Design a protein around this motif. Structure first.
Motif, mmCIF file in Angstrom:
data_model
loop_
_atom_site.group_PDB
_atom_site.id
_atom_site.type_symbol
_atom_site.label_atom_id
_atom_site.label_comp_id
_atom_site.label_asym_id
_atom_site.label_seq_id
_atom_site.Cartn_x
_atom_site.Cartn_y
_atom_site.Cartn_z
ATOM 1 N N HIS B 55 0.800 -1.206 -0.016
ATOM 2 C CA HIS B 55 -0.088 0.109 0.029
ATOM 3 C C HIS B 55 0.788 1.255 -0.095
ATOM 4 C CE1 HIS B 55 -3.527 2.525 0.672
ATOM 5 N NE2 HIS B 55 -2.944 3.012 1.968
ATOM 6 N N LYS B 56 1.952 1.164 0.721
ATOM 7 C CA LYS B 56 2.701 2.275 0.811
ATOM 8 C C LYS B 56 3.605 2.596 -0.316
ATOM 9 C CE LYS B 56 6.968 4.198 3.558
ATOM 10 N NZ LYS B 56 7.737 3.951 4.769
ATOM 11 N N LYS B 57 3.881 1.705 -1.206
ATOM 12 C CA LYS B 57 4.568 1.871 -2.495
ATOM 13 C C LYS B 57 3.310 2.368 -3.492
ATOM 14 C CE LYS B 57 6.653 -2.357 -2.507
ATOM 15 N N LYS B 59 0.548 4.027 -3.446
ATOM 16 C CA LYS B 59 0.211 5.358 -3.099
ATOM 17 C C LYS B 59 0.925 6.450 -3.809
ATOM 18 C CE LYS B 59 -0.185 5.534 1.528
ATOM 19 N NZ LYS B 59 -0.399 5.585 2.955
ATOM 20 N N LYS B 60 2.151 5.704 -4.368
ATOM 21 C CA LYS B 60 3.012 6.824 -5.005
ATOM 22 C C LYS B 60 2.709 6.435 -6.512
ATOM 23 C CE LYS B 60 7.037 6.542 -1.781
ATOM 24 N NZ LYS B 60 6.743 6.026 -0.430
ATOM 25 N N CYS B 61 1.894 5.541 -6.788
ATOM 26 C CA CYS B 61 1.762 5.237 -8.200
ATOM 27 C C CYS B 61 0.423 5.630 -8.709
ATOM 28 C CB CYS B 61 1.676 3.832 -8.583
ATOM 29 S SG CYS B 61 3.339 2.857 -8.271
ATOM 30 N N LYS B 63 -4.015 6.509 -7.071
ATOM 31 C CA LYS B 63 -5.019 6.807 -5.880
ATOM 32 C C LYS B 63 -5.597 5.362 -5.532
ATOM 33 N N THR B 64 -5.091 5.115 -4.152
ATOM 34 C CA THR B 64 -5.427 3.674 -3.538
ATOM 35 C C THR B 64 -6.727 3.800 -3.158
ATOM 36 O OG1 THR B 64 -4.493 4.150 -1.619
ATOM 37 C CG2 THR B 64 -3.188 3.114 -3.423
#
Lengths: 114, 111
Positions: B55-57, B59-61, B63-64
């Motif tokens: 999830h942390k990663k 979010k950088k890609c 919208k989660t």
């Protein structure tokens, strides 16, 4: 000498337990028993109900240690940890107190004579 | 004809879990993810922490979707099931919301 120390007594621990729930089935907790004997190690998985069934039969053979209670909050992790400890102490006490182990107990641990 | 066309079909479920406690360790939960695509099925097991690392990663890609909270102190059965459902919904939401899935999501699912 010190090597004979590997062939003297069965050493039993219950280092872990797991609670599992699959698909729509009821969950169950299994205790992973570690048996050290003759320089080898073996794992055996058992539910509390299987310890209790063992106990009921074993009482007819030997004076048994007190079994950990069935009347516990068996869904609470810390209670399950206490039960783990209690079951471990139980198996160790049977081994300590009984030089010739009942076949019932050996069978439970997947150990065979001769 | 249809030689250059293919189906983009992936479904994900989390049918099962296990909570493991072992003597000198923190208890932890492992979720079994079922991945369906292109006429085949496979499974991948992930600890709860691995979902949050994803999830942390992610979010950088993109919208989660919302995810259940990173930390859980007490894995009682109702919490296990609530987190199973929440994680399942999360993975399914990523697939529904994102036409092109990030490689890091595909890698998480062993696709």
């Amino acid at each position: 000498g010190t090597e004979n120390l590997y062939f003297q007594s069965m050493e039993v621990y219950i280092p872990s337990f797991r609670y599992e729930e699959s698909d729509l089935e009821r969950g169950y907790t299994v205790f992973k028993i570690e048996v050290l004997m003759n320089g080898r190690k073996h794992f055996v998985e058992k539910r509390y109900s299987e310890f209790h069934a063992l106990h009921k039969k074993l009482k007819k053979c030997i004076k048994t240690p007190e079994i950990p209670s069935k009347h516990v909050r068996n869904w609470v992790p810390k209670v399950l940890e206490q039960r783990r400890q209690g079951l471990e102490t139980y198996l160790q006490a049977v081994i300590l107190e009984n030089e010739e182990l009942p076949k019932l107990f050996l069978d439970f641990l997947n150990v065979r004579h001769l």
